Every structure is written in C-alpha cells, then in structure tokens.
C-alpha cells in the first residue's frame, strides 16, 4: 500500500517499514567536496555482452527490464565490489519536470531521472539469499539529463504504450542494456539501501558521474505511464522518486581525482 501519494509516500513509509529511519538509508545528496579520492578502489568492470532481456513489467510503482540472472551472463565487478555481482533487472525513477526526478542528487542537483542496475552478489544463490546480507547488492546508479536523444533507450520507450497500467508486461528479449550507459566509469560509491519499501539495507551503491542524455520526448513517454491499473481512475507515474535521507556515519568515495 505503499506509493509515492500525499498519503502512502516516503514521509509514511516507517510506519510499515521502521528501517526508513535506519543508519544506511538511500538515496542520499553526495557533497562533491566532501567526497574523498579512494586510491584503494579497484577498476570497475561491468560486463555485460551476454545479458539476456526477457521481459519489461510495470509493477505500480515503476517499470522493470527484466533479466535472466541464472547463469553470470551479465555482471558486474570491480570497483569497490569483492566478488560477483549478477545483473537482475534495471529501472528508473524521474519527475513530473524536468528539474526533479533523481534519488540521488550531486551538491543538491536534482537530475531529470535516474537508472538503477540492480544486482545480487552471487555468493548468496539467489536475490532473495541476498537481501538478508549486508553486502547482498549492487546497484549501478546513473544520472538522466534533458537534451539529446538516447538511441539505446528509444527500445524501451517504444515498448511502453502496452505496459502503461499496473500489473501490465510485454516481451523484452535483445535487449542491449550496454546503450544506456555513458562514455566514463568514473562513479561516488557509498553503503546504503534500497530507495523503496521494503528499504533493506544491502545495498553497495555505485553512481556515475557522467550523465546520460536523453531527449524531452523519451522523458516524456516515461510520464505518461500510469501508477494505477486497467479500469482505475488514472494516476500519472510521474514523481516516482525517493528524497536524499541523512548520510549519518558515511564517507562517499570517489573512483577519480
Ligand atoms: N507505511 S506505508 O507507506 O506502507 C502505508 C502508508 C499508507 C497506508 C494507508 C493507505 C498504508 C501503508
Ligand atoms: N520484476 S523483478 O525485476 O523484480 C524480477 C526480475 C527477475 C526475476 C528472476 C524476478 C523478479
Ligand atoms: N536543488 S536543485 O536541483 O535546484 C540544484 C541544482 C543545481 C545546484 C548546483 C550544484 C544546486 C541545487
Ligand atoms: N530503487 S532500488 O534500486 O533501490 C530497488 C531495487 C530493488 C528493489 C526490490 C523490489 O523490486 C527495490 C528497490
Ligand atoms: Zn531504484
């Protein structure tokens, strides 16, 4: 019953989810000057030639690229990661306009939207093994601003006229999420949660620098996605976003001078 309303959103969330006021909690503002240089951090590695896309479902809260995470076919590794972490689904999270829309905010900067890569370090055997650990999870955070097209997004914004209400999915398959990302790898990583209910705190969080840009257009076919399912009054899937929680005992590292 949880959403993003006046009345089930993330000021509600504790009263089912007493973890929303925990001490890692996600998404947070990561202050650029605060941020420290970690030499210790090795070069990330996301590979992810041998993804295998099956399915894009709307959930009601957002929409989901689906992958098939039976086998290491698209990983990611490296960085502040100790092992292998297997690709999952990805989604994202954006505005009613184009100056809100991002979880994560950079010396205060709110992006259009945001893409989250999830992953579950495969130690555990499977994502729901990986969530009851504190380092369960990866997700691979990246910035959306307005400007230019994306051509490896268009896929995904042409396929969402038939997911548009709750509980709605289509086939995904060929998916290249390889076309979503930018030219650098530079990346913040910090330890926190996931930005959503159940809002466990597993995640190792790695956001880029460098943000993707994506047309009006494509951003505005994301907003026209309803949170509601078939038949219900219409409720636009816009605002589907998190508030920066306090950092509290973290130091955000950074992957470059
Ligand atoms: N704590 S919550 O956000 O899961 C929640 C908010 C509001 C309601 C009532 C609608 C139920 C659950
Ligand atoms: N809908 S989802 O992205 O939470 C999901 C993706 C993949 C598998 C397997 C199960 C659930
Ligand atoms: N909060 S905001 O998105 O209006 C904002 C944008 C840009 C900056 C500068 C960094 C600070 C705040
Ligand atoms: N927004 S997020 O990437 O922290 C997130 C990933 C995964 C889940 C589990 C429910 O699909 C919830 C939130
Ligand atoms: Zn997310």
């Not at 995904?172 to 030219?183: I, M, V």
């Not at 951003?219 to 509290?248: H, I, S, T, Y």
């Amino acid at each position: 019953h949880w959403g993003y309303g006046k009345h089930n959103g993330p000021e509600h969330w504790h009263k089912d989810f007493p973890i929303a006021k925990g001490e890692r909690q996600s998404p947070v503002d990561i202050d650029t000057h605060t941020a420290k240089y970690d030499p210790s951090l090795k070069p990330l590695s996301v590979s992810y030639d041998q993804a295998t896309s099956l399915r894009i479902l709307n959930n009601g809260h957002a929409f989901n690229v689906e992958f098939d995470d039976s086998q290491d076919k698209a990983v990611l590794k490296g960085g502040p990661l100790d092992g292998t972490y297997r690709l999952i689904q990805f989604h994202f999270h954006w505005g009613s306009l184009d100056g809100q829309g991002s979880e994560h905010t950079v010396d205060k900067k709110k992006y259009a939207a945001e893409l989250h890569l999830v992953h579950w370090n495969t130690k555990y055997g499977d994502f729901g093994k990986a969530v009851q650990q504190p380092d369960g999870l990866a997700v691979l955070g990246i910035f959306l601003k307005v400007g230019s097209a994306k051509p490896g997004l268009q896929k995904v914004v042409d396929v969402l006229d038939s997911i548009k209400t709750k509980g709605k999915s289509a086939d995904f398959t060929n998916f290249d999420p390889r076309g979503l990302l930018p030219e650098s790898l530079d990346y913040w990583t910090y330890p926190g949660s996931l930005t959503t209910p159940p809002l466990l705190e597993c995640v190792t969080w790695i956001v880029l620098k460098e943000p993707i840009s994506v047309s009006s257009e494509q951003v505005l076919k994301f907003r026209k996605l309803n949170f509601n399912g078939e038949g219900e009054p219409e409720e636009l899937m816009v605002d589907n976003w998190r508030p920066a929680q306090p950092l509290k005992n973290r130091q955000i590292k950074a992957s470059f001078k």
